[PDB]
Amino acid sequence: MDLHSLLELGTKPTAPHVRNKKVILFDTNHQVSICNQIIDAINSGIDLGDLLEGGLLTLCVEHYYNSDKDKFNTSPIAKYLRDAGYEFDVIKNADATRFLDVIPNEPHYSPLILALKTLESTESQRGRIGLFLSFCSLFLPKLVVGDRASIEKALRQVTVHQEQGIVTYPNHWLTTGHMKVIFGILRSSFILKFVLIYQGVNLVTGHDAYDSIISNSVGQTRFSGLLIVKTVLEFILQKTDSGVTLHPLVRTSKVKNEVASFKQALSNLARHGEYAPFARVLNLSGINNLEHGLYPQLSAIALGVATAHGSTLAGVNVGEQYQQLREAAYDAEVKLQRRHEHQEIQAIAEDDEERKILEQFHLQKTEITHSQTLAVLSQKREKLARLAAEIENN
Amino acid sequence: MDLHSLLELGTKPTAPHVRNKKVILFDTNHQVSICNQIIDAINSGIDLGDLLEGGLLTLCVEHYYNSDKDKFNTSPIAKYLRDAGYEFDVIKNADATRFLDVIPNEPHYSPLILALKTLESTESQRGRIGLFLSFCSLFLPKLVVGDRASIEKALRQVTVHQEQGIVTYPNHWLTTGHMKVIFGILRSSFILKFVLIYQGVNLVTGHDAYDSIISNSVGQTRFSGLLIVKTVLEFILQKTDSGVTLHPLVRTSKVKNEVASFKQALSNLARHGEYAPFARVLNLSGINNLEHGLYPQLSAIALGVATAHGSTLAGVNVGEQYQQLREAAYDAEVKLQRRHEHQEIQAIAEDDEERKILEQFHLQKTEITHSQTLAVLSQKREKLARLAAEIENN
RNA sequence: UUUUUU
RNA sequence: UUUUUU
RNA sequence: UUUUUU
What we know:
The structure is cut from a larger assembly and holds two copies of chain A.
Chain A: E1 21-27, H1 31-43, H2 52-65, H3 71-74, H4 76-84, E2 86-92, H5 110-115, H6 127-136, H7 148-163, H8 176-188, H9 190-201, H10 209-219, H11 227-235, E3 238-239, E4 244-245, H12 256-269, H13 279-282, H14 298-309, H15 323-348, H16 352-393
Parallel strand pairs in A: 1-2
Antiparallel strand pairs in A: 3-4
Helix pairs in contact in A: 1-2, 2-9, 6-10, 9-10, 11-14, 14-15, 15-16
Chain B binds three RNA strands through residues 141-142, 144-146, 149, 157, 160-161, 163-164, 166, 216, 219-220, 224-225, 227, 280, 287-288, 291-294, 296, 307, 310-318, 321, 376, 380.
């Protein structure tokens, strides 16, 4: 009897799940105009409550699969969503021409029926759907950080993609109320985030403007709320050709339960295949075992070692109960790393003139990264002070 | 269990993709006049929105394959676009004589139907189509740099090809509004850029004026947004006959994760075969793994070493967070390279008179490249100051 | 709960 | 995001 | 892009 196996119980799911959901699909002869009516109903602020996930699935099936519902069901999006517990009931209506005529006759859709009579539609192309999905992909990196972080990252990606000349969005899409409602409809829908992630990752070759925007934004969403995974696996568990060895600041007996617990949490997380970098955004099952408050010493030490290697990770906020250990591991790794690079410069040169040139280069390089780290720290302090002045103002 | 394989997940596409697109093809008895009507509809500023990609495919099939649609489907352009996820639905209309009569009866094409009634057509030859495609190939090098860089490179290629006597373009094609709209229609279309790249690379022998312009402009587009690939693979990972060895400025332990990560990104990029130099323009799948912000030390060091070897790479702009490391690696490589050429001049001579002549030659050659590098730096500084004075003026 | 850069 | 030359 | 002579 192993009594210590009781501390790992109640984490892993045991079976594939018998929970079944129901999202509707619209089968219409006028699918492009139906889809554009869903776009301008969402953009107008109409809370289209239980029909949101089915309407967003009709936009994504219409854009990616020409709304045929036959090669959609063969496709691995639907195989994944069928194993996740979704069921597609197809609301077939061949003579429908408006969004009101396809909503089923239930009593609780009556605020939506009253809301959509006053909704005016401007006639628009098929490409407004792909414009909407490429705009919705811009909220995907820094989605789990908040709404202000998502809206600022998405505004920065709008100006980056408009200097490229790839896209241009309308000016009433870029107001802060509308970017609040698009953050709201993206954070809650699993199917919208998953099919933006799937068509971002798995499209190889023929990219239009929208496919390239979605593929660029899914590429910046990799390990989004999982900075602890990236800092521990790069800087704490170094891999050699001989094998994985620990770091000197984690190689004691106070830390070793967190290290052995973190390796079990990572081996749980890698059951998800190619969606393990997107685990915090898609809210997968191993997500509770990788928080900062489960590893209070491993996380602050790993961020201090990571900040000592790179300039930009001195902008990462932590809680007040992790700051001083982060600052201490930063100082210790600065001293250890200057000892190591002095030994390596003495190892790889050939003359005294060669080691004089390489010594002058690596001391100038270290002074460059230290001055950049202090610049990032000063603008982080001013950003926190400006946010606190806005919170005091509001 | 290799836990470090989780950091490479979510990058490579797993399957050939089940996303299918629909571009139309026009099958008409009067294909030359239909194609010239698409040329003067595009040149007039008519936003021919969803029919743009099919109209450009009809121009390219009419120019390259005589619009027969039977040897087009055997040809490897269509095999590549069929594996990319395109489907060609052929709008057969044997008695059509205008561009209005072949547009399908949909409600969202009605601004285009109203736009094309007022469009006047001048009757023109088959060679205005090849004139349009050779003009569209001139935006292909420096396409990913911007619109002003594309329009200035394309104006320079117009004057180069008119001193040759190969071509002459009409004077209303060379205004900046029209070159803005041809940059706009080339940046977004995958099929136009791909078939200009395919017929530029794979045409061996019988070139007319337009084929030679397209082949010259596709030859200058090789590694267009991939300067990091060219500078690292030339100057940082030197190949000997014995094998690949690193550079002394990247041979430490702070750099080795970026070097081993860059070799994985290059081995991803070389899955695309002969279209791997054109990966940033065609937006292929390995493109996110080769940015400057993923390798902040390898890229600035590699550009400094490259600038020390050649005069013209002192015109490359970088961000402000990479400039000083570029300047430092430039200084270190200047000192290391003068030590190496002094040793090689002592190795390859036979007398003292021979080494006196070779010493005087190589010191004059180094002074020539240093004065050229300072000239490039001064005109770069004045170009940036003039662009900032125009941005302040506008 | 997450916080940087890209 | 990309930035030079050809 | 090419630049001479024959």
